[PDB]
């Protein structure tokens, strides 16, 4: 049961610590201007706040 557990124990890396931040990435269409992104980052800020 050692190697039977070890092959199904997935050889991963270091765990995702709750490091007190998390990075939110936005990605608009190809050639979308900075007015739209701030407008989407109006929503995502309003989403993560309210």
């Amino acid at each position: 049961g050692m190697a039977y557990l070890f092959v199904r124990l997935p050889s991963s890396f270091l765990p995702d610590e709750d490091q007190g931040v998390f990075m939110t990435m936005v990605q608009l269409p190809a050639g979308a201007t900075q007015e739209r992104t701030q407008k989407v980052l109006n929503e995502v800020t309003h989403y993560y706040l309210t």
Binding site: P29, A30, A32, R36
Partner: protein, 53 residues
């Protein structure tokens, strides 16, 4: 030298798609991505003229 806003004659059938959706696929060929009555999108190409506003 004073700028002349020189008015001309009222483009009578002006397909004014906003710039937010029109992209160039392939090189030099603008493709609006019009969805039909099917609710299935169709990437019909256009010719993108004078960008007004």
């Amino acid at each position: 030298f004073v700028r002349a806003r020189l008015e001309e004659g009222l483009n009578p059938n002006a397909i004014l798609v906003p710039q937010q959706g029109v992209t160039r696929t392939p090189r030099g060929d603008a493709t609006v991505l019009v969805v039909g009555a099917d609710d299935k999108v169709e990437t019909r190409p256009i010719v993108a003229s004078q960008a007004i506003g």
